[PDB]
From a paper:
Here, we present structural information for the human antibody PN-SIA28’s heterosubtypic binding of hemagglutinin (HA) from circulating and emerging potential influenza A viruses (IAVs). The globular HA head domain recognizes host proteins bearing sialic acid on their surface, while the HA stem triggers the fusion of viral and host membranes following endocytosis, allowing release of viral contents into the cell.
Notably, binding of PN-SIA28 to bat H17 and H18 HAs also prevented their low pH-induced conformational change, indicating the potential neutralizing activity of this mAb against bat H17N10 and H18N11 viruses. To provide insight into the structural basis of the broad neutralizing activity of PN-SIA28 against group 1 and 2 IAVs, PN-SIA28 Fab fragments or Fab variable fragments were prepared and co-crystallized with H1-HA (A/swine/Guangdong/104/2013), H14-HA (A/long-tailed duck/Wisconsin/10OS3912/2010), or H18-HA (A/flat-faced bat/Peru/033/2010). The heavy chain paratopes of PN-SIA28 in the PN-SIA28/H1, PN-SIA28/H14, and PN-SIA28/H18 complexes are composed of large portions of CDRH2 and CDRH3, whereas the light chain paratope of PN-SIA28 in the PN-SIA28/H1 complex is composed of large portions of CDRL1. The light chain paratope of PN-SIA28 in the PN-SIA28/H14 complex is composed of large portions of CDRL1 and CDRL2, while the light chain paratope of PN-SIA28 in the PN-SIA28/H18 complex is composed of large portions of CDRL1 and CDRL3. In the H18 complex with PN-SIA28, the light chain uses its extra CDRL3 to contact helix A. Additionally, S30 (CDRL1) and S31 (CDRL1) are in the hydrogen bonding distance of helix A D46, and A91 (CDRL3) and A92 (CDRL3) are in hydrogen bonding distance of helix A Q42. Aside from the amino acid differences at position 38, the different orientations of His at HA1 amino acid 18 could also affect the overall energetics of binding between HA1 and the CDRH3 loop. Both the imidazoles of H18 from H1 and H18 HA1, which form hydrogen bonds with N20 of HA1, interact with the CDRH3 of PN-SIA28. The high-resolution structures of the PN-SIA28 Fab alone and PN-SIA28 Fab variable fragment in complex with H18 HA allow us to analyze conformational changes of PN-SIA28 upon HA binding in detail.
Author numbering:
A (entry chain C), B (entry chain C), C (entry chain C): 31 to 154
D (entry chain D), E (entry chain D), F (entry chain D): 43 to 149
G (entry chain B), H (entry chain B), I (entry chain B): 5 to 174
J (entry chain A): 11 to 119
K (entry chain A): 280 to 330
The structure:
Amino acid sequence: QVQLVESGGGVVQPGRSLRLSCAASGFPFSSYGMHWVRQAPGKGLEWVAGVSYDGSYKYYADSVKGRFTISRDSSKSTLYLQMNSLRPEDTAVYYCARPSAIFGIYIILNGLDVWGQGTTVTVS
Amino acid sequence: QVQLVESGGGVVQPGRSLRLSCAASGFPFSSYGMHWVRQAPGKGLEWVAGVSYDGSYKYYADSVKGRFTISRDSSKSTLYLQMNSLRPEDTAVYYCARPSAIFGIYIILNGLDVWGQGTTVTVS
Amino acid sequence: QVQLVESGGGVVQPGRSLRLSCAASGFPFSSYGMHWVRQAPGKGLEWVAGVSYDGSYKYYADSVKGRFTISRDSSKSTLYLQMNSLRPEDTAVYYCARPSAIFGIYIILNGLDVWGQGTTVTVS
Amino acid sequence: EIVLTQSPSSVSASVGDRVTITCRATQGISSWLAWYQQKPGKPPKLLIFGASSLQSGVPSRFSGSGSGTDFTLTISSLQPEDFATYFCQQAHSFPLTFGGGTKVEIK
Amino acid sequence: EIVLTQSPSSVSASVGDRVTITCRATQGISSWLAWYQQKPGKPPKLLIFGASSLQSGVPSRFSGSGSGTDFTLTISSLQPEDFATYFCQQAHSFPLTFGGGTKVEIK
Amino acid sequence: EIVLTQSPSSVSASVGDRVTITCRATQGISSWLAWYQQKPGKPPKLLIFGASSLQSGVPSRFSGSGSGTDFTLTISSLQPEDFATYFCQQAHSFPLTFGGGTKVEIK
Amino acid sequence: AIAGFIEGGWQGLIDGWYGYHHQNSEGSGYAADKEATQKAVDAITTKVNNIIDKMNTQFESTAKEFNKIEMRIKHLSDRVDDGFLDVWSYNAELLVLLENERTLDFHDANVNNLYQKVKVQLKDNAIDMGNGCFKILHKCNNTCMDDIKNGTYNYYEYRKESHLEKQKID
Amino acid sequence: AIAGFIEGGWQGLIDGWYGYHHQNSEGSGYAADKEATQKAVDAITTKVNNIIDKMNTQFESTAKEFNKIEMRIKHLSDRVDDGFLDVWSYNAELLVLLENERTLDFHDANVNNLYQKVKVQLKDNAIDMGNGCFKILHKCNNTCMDDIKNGTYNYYEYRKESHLEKQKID
Amino acid sequence: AIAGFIEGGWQGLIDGWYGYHHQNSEGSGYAADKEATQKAVDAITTKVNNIIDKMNTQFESTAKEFNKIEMRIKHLSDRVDDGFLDVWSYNAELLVLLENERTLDFHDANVNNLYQKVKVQLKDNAIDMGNGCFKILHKCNNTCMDDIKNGTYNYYEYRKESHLEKQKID
Amino acid sequence: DQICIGYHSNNSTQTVNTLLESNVPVTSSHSILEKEHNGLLCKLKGKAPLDLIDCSLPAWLMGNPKCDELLTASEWAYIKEDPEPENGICFPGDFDSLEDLILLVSNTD
Amino acid sequence: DCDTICQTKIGAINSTLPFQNIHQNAIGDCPKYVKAQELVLATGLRNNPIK
Ligand SMILES: *[C@@H]1O[C@H](CO)[C@@H](O[C@@H]2O[C@H](CO)[C@@H](O[C@@H]3O[C@H](CO[C@H]4O[C@H](CO)[C@@H](O)[C@H](O)[C@@H]4O)[C@@H](O)[C@H](O[C@H]4O[C@H](CO)[C@@H](O)[C@H](O)[C@@H]4O)[C@@H]3O)[C@H](O)[C@H]2NC(C)=O)[C@H](O)[C@H]1NC(C)=O
Ligand SMILES: *[C@@H]1O[C@H](CO)[C@@H](O[C@@H]2O[C@H](CO)[C@@H](O[C@@H]3O[C@H](CO[C@H]4O[C@H](CO)[C@@H](O)[C@H](O)[C@@H]4O)[C@@H](O)[C@H](O[C@H]4O[C@H](CO)[C@@H](O)[C@H](O)[C@@H]4O)[C@@H]3O)[C@H](O)[C@H]2NC(C)=O)[C@H](O)[C@H]1NC(C)=O
Ligand SMILES: *[C@@H]1O[C@H](CO)[C@@H](O[C@@H]2O[C@H](CO)[C@@H](O[C@@H]3O[C@H](CO[C@H]4O[C@H](CO)[C@@H](O)[C@H](O)[C@@H]4O)[C@@H](O)[C@H](O[C@H]4O[C@H](CO)[C@@H](O)[C@H](O)[C@@H]4O)[C@@H]3O)[C@H](O)[C@H]2NC(C)=O)[C@H](O)[C@H]1NC(C)=O
Ligand SMILES: *[C@@H]1O[C@H](CO[C@@H]2O[C@@H](C)[C@@H](O)[C@@H](O)[C@@H]2O)[C@@H](O)[C@H](O)[C@H]1NC(C)=O
Ligand SMILES: *[C@@H]1O[C@H](CO[C@@H]2O[C@@H](C)[C@@H](O)[C@@H](O)[C@@H]2O)[C@@H](O)[C@H](O)[C@H]1NC(C)=O
Ligand SMILES: *[C@@H]1O[C@H](CO[C@@H]2O[C@@H](C)[C@@H](O)[C@@H](O)[C@@H]2O)[C@@H](O)[C@H](O)[C@H]1NC(C)=O
Ligand SMILES: *[C@@H]1O[C@H](CO)[C@@H](O)[C@H](O)[C@H]1NC(C)=O
Ligand SMILES: *[C@@H]1O[C@H](CO)[C@@H](O)[C@H](O)[C@H]1NC(C)=O
Ligand SMILES: *[C@@H]1O[C@H](CO)[C@@H](O)[C@H](O)[C@H]1NC(C)=O
Ligand SMILES: *[C@@H]1O[C@H](CO)[C@@H](O)[C@H](O)[C@H]1NC(C)=O
Ligand SMILES: *[C@@H]1O[C@H](CO)[C@@H](O)[C@H](O)[C@H]1NC(C)=O
Ligand SMILES: *[C@@H]1O[C@H](CO)[C@@H](O)[C@H](O)[C@H]1NC(C)=O
């Protein structure tokens, strides 16, 4: 019942823009912070961005700073990642991950208990 | 050996004044706060006034505010209740009660361990 | 291996000056405070002066105030007591004593664990 | 003002019965409750202070319990000299207030 | 940035073996470490959080230990379904960082 | 100035005796008392610090007790080498002060 | 004259555990913080009762006799009671030692908590003397003193008067 | 509107145990002190685990049967288990009672420690309202609020602006 | 350069547990609060001795042998010692864990208590830097530094000089 | 002009475990658990034990000829016996109530 | 030729520390037997020196 669904990935030329969507259901989406984690083909996991539950605070990895913008829609229970000035090194499978809560508080810095199947972004 | 003695009650016309006296003996009267508690015939107990050990602080029920004045005499070990503008609803048996001490401190807010026989005030 | 050595005592006329030396070895002399303790012939022990490890703080008994000056040399691991305006009542055997450390901190106010053989000052 | 609601207003029982009287407060008074026994024509007598502590010279068949809002006075085995009216009094803050009262009477 | 160094980069073992994977951090991350299991084509699965706590629905043969800088993930008795790639993730501070990864493969 | 009053000024005893020496302070010095043993012509030797702690290399027949104002040094079973003068020293505050002294001598 | 909690307790504070002393034009006197005394009295009473009432024990028996040729079983019974004697004695000693130190710290925290509440009310309308007392930089009549003890003192009401008194000190 | 820790907790603080609430021109909101929450979560988790994991026990046995003419030995076994039942029950009760009181004090100290850090940063560029909130004597934009929560607020940067706002209050 | 207790301890403080560091025209150096070190050393020594000396035990025996046909009695003796082993081990572990946490808190309170005493002496003749250090708003010569460490610093003596230095900062 | 409040630090590598934290470095510590024994059999409060050489307790008490005779009045704080004594009950037969007898004779004045 | 207040069959425990993990059985004035590997009380401060 609790699972995320990514969408919006595809083949894109260098320098263009994409917006990813992460549709959440089964849990109080507006209580959790959210993260985007990408994985290049054959490589490891890289965290790119994160946003607080109310969207007031946003954190970005240096590799996507100034080009990626995270955001969320409370009424649609959806998380977004706007990706600008795309580069071939941005090519990866992009996951939206939910940080685990503990002691009943939704801490954004924790392990990631829920992931979606991921969406593929190919820049070439 | 430890007991109080009320006096000064009697039949009084409406609007007149009375002063009650509570003679204490057997205990350090000047260390305790003191209270006056009245009981209308056939009714329950009503607290009317209280005074700290040194007389610096005084507390009154709303029903007697501005008309009753509590006071004490350290040298005579006597507690007083000056009753002005007496009304038929002031008719009651008036007791002076000693709050219980605990842990060696004479707290004014506690149960009442010592009572006198009471004095009767009839307003009609 | 750990022991002090006093020197500089001798026969001296009233009003003259002497400087005592306490050569320390076997221990980190610059971590301890130091004290001078004198004993008149046939009498008890009297503390006269003390100095902190870095020499910044100095303590004197009233009997030698303004006439005695304590001091130390870090490079020579030596403690000094400059004695001015000597009086017959200053005649005593003079010891330099090390305060004991405890819990790993070199507290100057403690018992004295190390003493030298002492040096004799005779004022007459 | 903290109001104390005493239940029942009265009860009838015989000697050796177990009698329960409750006192309900509008707000938390922690442990500052007192229980009094009053025979007609006589001043009240302090039985329980601290909502459970037995006053010196009071038989052990009188017991009190409770904390915060609900309090109970229990007479385990009634005696002839226990037929009287009982009041609960709060000592949390001024004004001092009493319960409506409970008369224990023979059947 | 806190960097997590995972050892070994890969290891080969058979079913029933005991497998040890270590994760080393440049600075103290207390207990904020996570372990993930990832089969090809599938998202990572949370196995261990708090560097030792077992995630609900994960067999008890997976265990984690460590605090501060050095952490260890142990599979006591390997199973056929345990052949995958394993990642350690820190949760001490932003940016979130992962280890290089460890593939457990058949010999 | 804190003054230490030592009692007795002297005492005579034989080998194997139990010897008690007391040290009285004008004000609370907590535990900062020391006991010293001094043979003629020699510097004092530290026996007890902290008013009870035995100094390393000192036989267990020497013991000290006390706190605040009254302190006691006890030699359970005297030995030939224990005949000397004993001093109590406070370490609470400057100026450091000593007791009058106690000579233990043969009868 | 008259200092605060830094230099010790008050023999004049008799109607409570914690309180205040004041001096202004209209007089002086002691007054207990009744509510703080109430809250601490409940805590201390609960702690003592918990240490006492939690001792819920099984029925104690004195049947510890074995026959003449079973002295080894009697010794086992003897050392069983010795073991529990050592366990209860050691735990009871350190329980009292630990709780007594914490109880004294509990009173210190309560006293300090009254001192902080008054300090944050007066702000810079008063000067902290460092002995547990405050030097009010304005006239504080008996109503003003009661407002401080009730937590209803107004900073901005006496602010201008205090400011002029402060610049005189400067 | 909106008060601090003196008057109770916040239902709006959901992403941490301890945090802050702000209001300026650009808006308002809650924000948890993530690091302080991290440090306290480790402490509480360690305390519970220590109380649980330290119970390293010998192998428990149910062989407590003696023959028909050895009822006294059976009674000795019965009272041995009664003794350990009393020991463990009493120690377990007071362990939970003591630790629970200390755990609540632990949270209070952590909350007070955040309050002191903000107080010493703002110094007199703000007025302590006494309810756990501070009345900034200058405009504090969203960057300024983040600097306070990160411990990088500069006293001398807003010092002149705060001084003029203070003398108006005087 | 040179910060206070907020950022950690001092390797240069060797003559005491708690102390001060100063800097003025005449130089700099470390100095231990000897009296505070004295009071804490007594407390720690008493705590260790109480944990050690309170272990007043009955005479320990090794006579735990029963005959060949009394193996059940031997098992009862075996599990009796197992029970006490579990009781003492668990209590000893949590005793050390609890006391160690309290001992570290004890040192923190002592350090904070020195920081509060200096803070209330300097009042607003100094600026709290937030790192355990104070920025004296006036010249504080070596006599002045000793007065602060002895608790005899006078607020009104340097008050005018500090006020002029403060308005420059504003 | 500055004054700071600080505390003591050193190079001690000692760590202690608290109820909230593990392996906390401390400037000094004190162990309350004795982990060492001298590996010797000693007197107990200055009272010597009884050494059975190579004889069991029943053999020594009954006077096995290969066992040392008690020639003089003696005392002992405890009885030391070899794990597998060379000289025991030389003439086959059960020694009754040995465990009870041990309680009587292990510590004598 | 030694004297102890506590004796075990593998060696003497001449100690006044309240606990010991040496041997389950002993004689005399002895510490309580525990299975703890270490019981270390903190006496000093947190050793976290400034860099
Ligand atoms: C053989 O020996 C054993 C041990 O001594 C006896 O067992 C004890 O029996 C007494 C009485 O039967 C028990 O005490 C009772 O416990 C009840 C449960 O208490 C728990 O729950 C309540 C809430 O319901 C809590 O308040 C309490 O703290 C406990 O957590 C109570 O409900 C009983 O209350 C009675 O007393 C109060 C006044 O004290 C009255 O107000 C009540 O109305 C009620 O009358 C009571 O406290 C005790 O727990 C038993 N202990 C054990 C170890 O078994 C046997 O009775 C004895 N056999 C014989 C024949 O004497
Ligand atoms: C008869 O009954 C007894 C009592 O139940 C059993 O004895 C227990 O046996 C278990 C397992 O053999 C013991 O547990 C082990 O303890 C080892 C030592 O632990 C200490 O040291 C480590 C650091 O090295 C500390 O972390 C720890 O807290 C202790 O301070 C551990 O090294 C073992 O670790 C094992 O488990 C972990 C996961 O839990 C793995 O990661 C490890 O790799 C390793 O596999 C383990 O914890 C226990 O201590 C014994 N207790 C007693 C009282 O003896 C007997 O086994 C039993 N007999 C039979 C035949 O069943
Ligand atoms: C069989 O086994 C038992 C247990 O081991 C032995 O009993 C112990 O005997 C010793 C010595 O007889 C006891 O120790 C003594 O306790 C006395 C009372 O102590 C309490 O009161 C004092 C204040 O008066 C407190 O300071 C103390 O903390 C206690 O609260 C002390 O007065 C004794 O002091 C002696 O020693 C000190 C130095 O340590 C000297 O300065 C004194 O002058 C004095 O000589 C002493 O401490 C112990 O308490 C007993 N324990 C038990 C459980 O009984 C038996 O002795 C033993 N039988 C044989 C034959 O050996
Ligand atoms: C109670 O509140 C729930 C949300 O709060 C969350 O869950 C609790 C258990 C804690 O973990 C808290 O820290 C979390 O923020 C709701 O899901 C639930 O419906 C509410 N229940 C009621 C009856 O209103
Ligand atoms: C001691 O003081 C008594 C009055 O103090 C009261 O009693 C003590 C026990 C505590 O409860 C304290 O809080 C109370 O205020 C006098 O009655 C008594 O005479 C005095 N004794 C002497 C010897 O002076
Ligand atoms: C470590 O430091 C030592 C000096 O420090 C002193 O000793 C320690 C044990 C504590 O008591 C501390 O308070 C003292 O100030 C040196 O003697 C030693 O050589 C140093 N060791 C190393 C390896 O550098
Ligand atoms: C105390 O001050 C207030 C403030 O103006 C005033 O209203 C009140 O009358 C004063 N009371 C007395 C007794 O002067
Ligand atoms: C005292 O404070 C209470 C709130 O706790 C308030 O209702 C009351 O009016 C105040 N009274 C005075 C005289 O300050
Ligand atoms: C906040 O204030 C700083 C200080 O001048 C300024 O640099 C920054 O632009 C301001 N931000 C906004 C959003 O006004
Ligand atoms: C927050 O504080 C850290 C130091 O802990 C510092 O490195 C960082 O630059 C600060 N960032 C902001 C936005 O204040
Ligand atoms: C320090 O200042 C005081 C205050 O005037 C002065 O009396 C003293 O001489 C000064 N000391 C030095 C060394 O300047
Ligand atoms: C230090 O303080 C003491 C009081 O504790 C006082 O008697 C002494 O004169 C002071 N000395 C200095 C130099 O401040």
